[PDB]
Design a protein around this ligand. Structure first.
Ligand SMILES: Nc1ncnc2c1ncn2[C@@H]1O[C@H](COP(=O)(O)OP(=O)(O)O)[C@@H](O)[C@H]1O
Ligand SMILES: [Mg+2]
Ligand SMILES: [Mg+2]
Ligand SMILES: [Mg+2]
Ligand SMILES: [Mg+2]
Ligand SMILES: [Mg+2]
Lengths: 28, 471
């Protein structure tokens, strides 16, 4: 639909690398 | 009905392609690039002119709303925090270091780390804690059916495949305790009201996901506040306790078809939606018994939206794709799964799960849904922008925020329970305690603040009037 095309327009580049590097310190 | 409340949100923080960057430095840049200092009596830690706290906590930037009295205002000043975070990151890009900093209003990296969105509620000290525990555990186990933000990956380490209702559920391990960073309890017991501890308990709730959806945040805060009123008044006669509540929390989250049945100690078998309906029915009876039709409009609205949401969840949850985060997110996720034949292990689904919470208006997926008219709003953007710099009028945040706006240069420090002035020609600092959350309001100090042209005049006028304006 129209909204999946809008999301496709803005998704982060290099999706697999982006997900693998999203690493956070533990918080509360 | 009113209730003093506030929301603390720890934001995820990402600084790609910067080998000098660490989480503490990046979080400090965010706090410092936006903006007096905090009165602990060493990390970046400021009070804003809307009465909020912006600071580095556990290597995350954190925004803590001013004290508010109702769930619409909680939504408003919490949404202002998202705008403050987005602007802070934009301003940090202008610092000499030049880092591009991304911030996420979520709760996990899907790799075993979790960070918190805490709700705070002011209660009578006299309410016995055993009743707080036994009535809140089943409510907190099940309210994720409308509070959940959605998550791709099952288990704390994310190794199981599939979708679940909540980001936080896999990180809870015990029923009751002090912890917030490990072995997390469904009911946290820390009781630090920053107010008269003979009068008040501050209930510190740690189990909720951060929500983007204003409807979800509204229901989260508003339904909890109604349940607390029933607990305070001893109104709940039923036993809602369930077998293995930590296991039930996870099992509810892991079943987005909403059919998993909790096993109540009294013998009943109820889905999470059905158990929520039992709390809603009691809340309706409570309000009818106490007030008749003399119910305030916001309480009526919370009850109506709570019931409507539960009815639609039991009918077809996907009709709530404009209201609830996990439904809005799942609708995108299933769209891609259908369009591109993706399994639940696909990295693109992980990216949607995370980027949904990106605070950028141009890149965050929730923000794109809003821009395209595909998400229902509760407040309007003009009011959100005003709440970034003006405090609520009906709590002590009013005094705190207006003092910083008007006499900021002469504010040495501030906290939830004090404002400390540094007056010219004085060797000693002037500590003004603000010990009652519902004093220090515009009705108490607004006219005084209007007519004072300097902080020296203000402290003079407040002298000996502490038990008038603030306690
Ligand atoms: N008396 C009170 N009752 C309920 N909430 C309160 C009270 N005083 C402050 N708050 C809220 O509690 C939160 C405290 O935030 P923060 O300073 O981050 O707490 P902590 O030091 O526990 O992390 C804020 O949202 C604030 O509005
Ligand atoms: Mg904290
Ligand atoms: Mg905090
Ligand atoms: Mg914190
Ligand atoms: Mg214990
Ligand atoms: Mg502390």
């Amino acid at each position: 639909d129209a909204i999946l095309d809008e999301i496709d327009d803005v998704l982060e580049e290099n999706a697999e690398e982006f997900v693998r590097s999203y690493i956070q310190k533990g918080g509360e | 009905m009113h209730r003093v409340m506030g929301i603390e949100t720890e934001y995820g923080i990402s600084v790609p392609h910067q080998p000098n960057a660490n989480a503490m430095a990046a979080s400090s840049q965010v706090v410092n690039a936006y903006a007096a200092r905090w009165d602990f009596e060493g990390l970046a830690n400021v009070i804003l002119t809307n009465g909020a706290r912006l600071y580095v906590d556990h290597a995350h930037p954190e925004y803590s709303t001013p004290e508010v009295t109702n769930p619409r205002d909680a939504v408003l000043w919490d949404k202002a925090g998202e705008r403050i975070m987005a602007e802070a990151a934009r301003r940090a890009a202008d610092l000499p270091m030049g880092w591009t900093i991304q911030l996420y209003k979520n709760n996990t990296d899907n790799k075993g780390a979790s960070y918190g969105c805490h709700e705070n509620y002011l209660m009578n000290r006299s309410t016995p804690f055993a009743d707080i525990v036994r009535h809140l555990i089943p409510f907190f186990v099940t309210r994720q059916v409308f509070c959940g933000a959605g998550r791709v990956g099952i288990g704390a380490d994310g190794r199981g495949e599939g979708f679940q209702l909540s980001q936080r559920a896999d990180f809870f391990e015990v029923e009751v305790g002090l912890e917030t960073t490990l072995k997390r309890p469904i009911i946290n017991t820390r009781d630090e009201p920053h107010a008269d501890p003979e009068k008040y308990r501050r209930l510190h709730v740690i189990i909720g996901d951060a929500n983007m959806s204003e409807i979800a945040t509204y229901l989260k805060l508003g339904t909890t506040a109604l349940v607390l009123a029933m607990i305070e008044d001893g109104f709940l006669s039923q036993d809602f306790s369930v077998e293995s509540p930590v296991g039930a929390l996870r099992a509810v989250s892991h079943d987005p078809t909403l059919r998993y049945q909790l096993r109540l100690h009294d013998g009943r078998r109820l889905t999470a939606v059905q158990l929520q309906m039992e709390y809603l029915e009691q809340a309706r009876k409570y309000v009818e018994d106490r007030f008749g039709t003399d119910v305030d409009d916001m309480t009526r609205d919370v009850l109506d939206r709570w019931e409507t949401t539960l009815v639609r969840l039991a009918d077809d949850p996907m009709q709530l794709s404009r209201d609830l985060d996990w439904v809005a997110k799942l609708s995108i996720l299933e769209g891609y799964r259908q369009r591109e034949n993706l399994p639940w292990s696909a990295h693109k689904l992980q990216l949607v799960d995370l980027q949904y919470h990106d605070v950028r208006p141009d890149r965050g997926l929730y923000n794109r849904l809003v821009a395209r008219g595909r998400m229902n709003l509760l407040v309007d953007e003009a009011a959100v922008r005003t709440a970034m710099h003006e405090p609520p009028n009906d709590t002590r945040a009013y005094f705190r925020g207006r003092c910083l706006a008007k006499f900021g240069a002469e504010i040495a420090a501030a906290s939830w329970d004090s404002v400390i002035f540094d007056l010219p020609g004085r060797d000693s600092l002037q500590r003004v305690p603000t010990l009652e959350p519902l004093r220090g309001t515009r009705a108490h100090v607004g006219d005084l603040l209007d007519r004072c042209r300097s902080a020296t005049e203000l402290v003079a006028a407040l002298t000996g009037g502490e038990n008038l304006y603030f306690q």
